[PDB]
Write a protein that binds this ligand. Structure first.
Ligand SMILES: N#C[C@@H]1CC[C@@H](NOS(=O)(=O)O)CN1C=O
Ligand SMILES: [Cl-]
Length: 244
């Protein structure tokens, strides 16, 4: 019996309180609902940043560039984060958002195959340009929050043009939370090498009954913000709406 006015006000306040500008798009069946404090972001293009790991992994697994058990060794060079200075599978690297592992995977795939596959899947503007190892971080690849939630809807329902097994393997890599019988599958993103910086959390809720509710959160990140604000705003929004 809560009014849509009150839901909208609540979710807007979550973005207002974090002192940023963002949107969260929720999909139920075929209907998109846009919430937040900057609704106009819904159809604007931003770099996907680490959300691209989802598709990079699909492409690599489908094209036999890696397996799910393969350990990508740390080369022993210093990394931005100490947590990345270790050997990891694709799944472990998904959870740690270990860019160097996904860069190696992109390089194995190669520019020609990567462009063909990104085009085939129709992801965002589909332009990867000439640099196979950073196109999702600094451009030219861009995508809208609407496109991101539709991608998540496709993956959640095994509708992407990949083998069922490929989709299931990558979805297993994306489980980030269980809340009162609901599972949240998602990938975060933070485009640090663009200005303004973009933050993402794109995924879906799998409810106890098997129903899947895709979402994409998209906001402006500032130097000094905590990455966990993406998760906190998302969980509060999903809870406010009764999705979890
Ligand atoms: N570089 C870079 C950015 C930010 C640091 C890494 N962590 O990714 S994130 O926490 O999911 O956004 C990987 N990455 C992806 O968006
Ligand atoms: Cl990445």
């Amino acid at each position: 019996h809560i009014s849509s006015q009150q839901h909208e006000k609540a979710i807007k306040s979550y973005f207002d309180e974090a002192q940023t500008q963002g949107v969260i798009i929720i999909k139920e069946g075929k209907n998109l609902s846009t919430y937040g404090n900057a609704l106009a972001r819904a159809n604007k293009e931003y770099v996907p940043a680490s959300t691209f790991k989802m598709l990079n992994a699909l492409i690599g697994l489908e094209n036999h560039k890696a397996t799910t058990n393969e350990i990508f060794k740390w080369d022993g060079k210093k990394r931005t984060y100490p947590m990345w200075e270790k050997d990891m599978t694709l799944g472990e690297a998904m959870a740690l958002s270990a860019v160097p592992v996904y860069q190696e995977l992109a390089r194995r795939t190669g520019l020609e195959l990567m462009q063909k596959e990104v085009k085939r899947v129709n992801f965002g503007n589909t332009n990867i340009g000439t640099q196979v190892d950073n196109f999702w971080l600094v451009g030219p690849l861009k995508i809208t929050p609407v496109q991101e939630v539709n991608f998540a809807d496709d993956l959640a329902h095994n509708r992407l043009p990949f083998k069922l097994e490929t989709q299931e393997e990558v979805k297993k890599m994306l489980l980030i939370k269980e809340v009162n019988g609901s599972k949240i599958y998602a990938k975060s993103g933070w485009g640090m090498g663009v200005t303004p910086q973009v933050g993402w959390l794109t995924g879906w809720v799998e409810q106890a009954n098997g129903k899947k509710i895709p979402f994409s959160l998209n906001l402006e990140m500032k130097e000094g913000m905590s990455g966990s604000i993406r998760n906190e705003i998302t969980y509060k929004s999903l809870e406010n709406l009764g999705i979890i």
